[PDB]
Every structure is written in structure tokens, then in C-alpha cells.
Amino acid sequence: ILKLLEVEHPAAKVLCELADLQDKEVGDGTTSVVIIAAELLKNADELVKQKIHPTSVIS
Amino acid sequence: IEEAKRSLHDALCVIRNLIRDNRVVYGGGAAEISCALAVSQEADKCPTLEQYAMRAFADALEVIPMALSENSGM
Amino acid sequence: GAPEIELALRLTEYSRTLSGMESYCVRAFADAMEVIPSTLAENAGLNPISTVTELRN
């Protein structure tokens, strides 16, 4: 769907791309790797907002 | 009386504060600077974050005569 | 950026050595070096606030 979906924001830009980059390699972990960035982007969401330079936790 | 009274009194108060221990000490930026010059140049001798506090504190030791200087006109 | 923070430490005192109306100038000048590694000690993460404190010392 992300490909038939037409990406509005540069965020979901790479998502349709990375899901496809995952999908080009192999058809699974694809629809997920969309969420998992955001899922990490939710994990570091308040972190970056808390005290955290994510450079620490992202490494 | 708002002049003479408290003049005699703050004389009376300082005169006590000498006649007890008579310490002749010098203001007017001459202490204000050099206290800072010590402190500010000593401010970098504690590698604790308040080393910033220590530095910017000292020019406040100098901030009093700064005002006196415009009052003086300098 | 150590030479930033390194000499930021010093030139202040040497600014302070200058006296004159530009001692407060050159010291402010000398300070400015500290913020470059601050942002660097910022961007690389964690604490710039600490980083330059001890370093200049």
C-alpha cells in the first residue's frame, strides 16, 4: 500500500522506501520496519525531549 | 536631621566597628577589582561546573564601583 | 575544539591582564571560543555544560 499510498511528508518518504528496501531484499520485516522506526521514534521520542541527546542512546 | 542624625549614627556605628576592631580598609573598586582579580583568576582553580559561577561571580565583586564610576562621571 | 576551550581559558586572563576598556572586551572575545566545542560537546551528546568547564581548567 505505501507504494500505492502517495507519501505526504519526508518522514514517511523513507518509510515507503525503507520498507521497500527491506522488501527488495526480502518480502518480510517490511510492513513492520515502517512502524519500528516510529516505534523507536516513540522510544526516543520523550528521551530526545527528556535530557537525552539521542546520539547516546541511538549508538 | 534626616542627614545629621543617621550621619552621627552610622558614624557611631562604624566608629564602634573600628573602636572594637579598628580595621582600615579601602573600597572604591580598589578592593572590588582585586578581590575579583583574585577570585576570578582563582575561579578557574576549581574544575567544577560552578567554575562558571566562580568566574561571573567575581565581576560582580567589581560591579559596585562600576555604578560609582558613572556617578563619579567616569 | 580543545584549542578553542584551551585558549578561551587563557586569553580571558590575558585580556584581564590588558586592563583598559577592552579587557572586558577581549575576555568576552576569549570566551567565545568555548561555545564552539560546547555545541560540539552538545551535538556529540550529553553534557557540553560540563565539558568545557573542566577542559578550560
From Swiss-Prot, chain A:
Annotated ATP binding sites: G29, T30, T31
Sites where the protein binds ADP: G29, T30, T31, S32
Annotated residues for binding of Mg(2+): D28
Origin superkingdom: Eukaryota
Function: Component of the chaperonin-containing T-complex (TRiC), a molecular chaperone complex that assists the folding of actin, tubulin and other proteins upon ATP hydrolysis. The TRiC complex mediates the folding of WRAP53/TCAB1, thereby regulating telomere maintenance. As part of the TRiC complex may play a role in the assembly of BBSome, a complex involved in ciliogenesis regulating transports vesicles to the cilia.
Binding partners and assembly: Component of the chaperonin-containing T-complex (TRiC), a hexadecamer composed of two identical back-to-back stacked rings enclosing a protein folding chamber. Each ring is made up of eight different subunits: TCP1/CCT1, CCT2, CCT3, CCT4, CCT5, CCT6A/CCT6, CCT7, CCT8. Interacts with PACRG. Interacts with GBA1. Interacts with DLEC1.
Illness association: Intellectual developmental disorder with polymicrogyria and seizures: An autosomal dominant neurologic disorder characterized by a broad phenotypic spectrum. Main clinical features are developmental delay of varying severity, intellectual disability, seizures, and polymicrogyria. Additional variable features are non-specific pyramidal or cerebellar signs, and visual impairment.
Protein name per UniProt: T-complex protein 1 subunit alpha
Organism this protein belongs to: Homo sapiens
Location of this fragment in the whole protein: 61 to 119 of 556
Curated annotation (Swiss-Prot), chain B:
Inducing factors: Down-regulated in response to enterovirus 71 (EV71) infection (at protein level).
Subcellular location per the Swiss-Prot or TrEMBL entry: Cytoplasm; Cytoplasm, Cytoskeleton, Microtubule organizing center, Centrosome
Record PTM: Ubiquitinated by the DCX(DCAF12) complex specifically recognizes the diglutamate (Glu-Glu) at the C-terminus, leading to its degradation.
UniProt binding sites for ATP: G28
Residues that coordinate or bind ADP: G28
Assembly and binders: Component of the chaperonin-containing T-complex (TRiC), a hexadecamer composed of two identical back-to-back stacked rings enclosing a protein folding chamber. Each ring is made up of eight different subunits: TCP1/CCT1, CCT2, CCT3, CCT4, CCT5, CCT6A/CCT6, CCT7, CCT8. Interacts with PACRG. Interacts with DNAAF4. Interacts with DLEC1. Interacts with SPMAP2.
Family, as annotated: Belongs to the TCP-1 chaperonin family.
Reported function: Component of the chaperonin-containing T-complex (TRiC), a molecular chaperone complex that assists the folding of actin, tubulin and other proteins upon ATP hydrolysis. The TRiC complex mediates the folding of WRAP53/TCAB1, thereby regulating telomere maintenance. As part of the TRiC complex may play a role in the assembly of BBSome, a complex involved in ciliogenesis regulating transports vesicles to the cilia.
Disease: Neuropathy, hereditary sensory, with spastic paraplegia, autosomal recessive: A disease characterized by spastic paraplegia and progressive distal sensory neuropathy leading to mutilating ulcerations of the upper and lower limbs.
Protein name, UniProt field: T-complex protein 1 subunit epsilon
Record organism: Homo sapiens (Human)
Lineage of the species this protein comes from: Eukaryota, Metazoa, Chordata, Craniata, Vertebrata
UniProtKB/Swiss-Prot annotation, chain C:
Modified residues (Phosphoserine): S19
Localization terms from the record: Cytoplasm; Melanosome; Cytoplasm, Cytoskeleton, Microtubule organizing center, Centrosome; Cytoplasm, Cytoskeleton, Cilium basal body
Cysteines joined through disulfide linkages: none
Domain of life: Eukaryota
Subunit record text: Component of the chaperonin-containing T-complex (TRiC), a hexadecamer composed of two identical back-to-back stacked rings enclosing a protein folding chamber. Each ring is made up of eight different subunits: TCP1/CCT1, CCT2, CCT3, CCT4, CCT5, CCT6A/CCT6, CCT7, CCT8. Interacts with PACRG. Interacts with DNAAF4. Interacts with DLEC1.
Family: Belongs to the TCP-1 chaperonin family.
Record: disease: De novo genetic variants in nearly every subunit of the TRiC complex, including CCT4, have been found in individuals with a broad spectrum of brain malformations, and clinical phenotypes ranging from mild to severe epilepsy, developmental delay, intellectual disability, ataxia, and other features of cerebral malfunction.
Purpose of the protein: Component of the chaperonin-containing T-complex (TRiC), a molecular chaperone complex that assists the folding of actin, tubulin and other proteins upon ATP hydrolysis. The TRiC complex mediates the folding of WRAP53/TCAB1, thereby regulating telomere maintenance. As part of the TRiC complex may play a role in the assembly of BBSome, a complex involved in ciliogenesis regulating transports vesicles to the cilia.
Protein name as it appears in the record: T-complex protein 1 subunit delta
Provenance organism: Homo sapiens
Portion of the full-length sequence here: 426 to 482 of 539
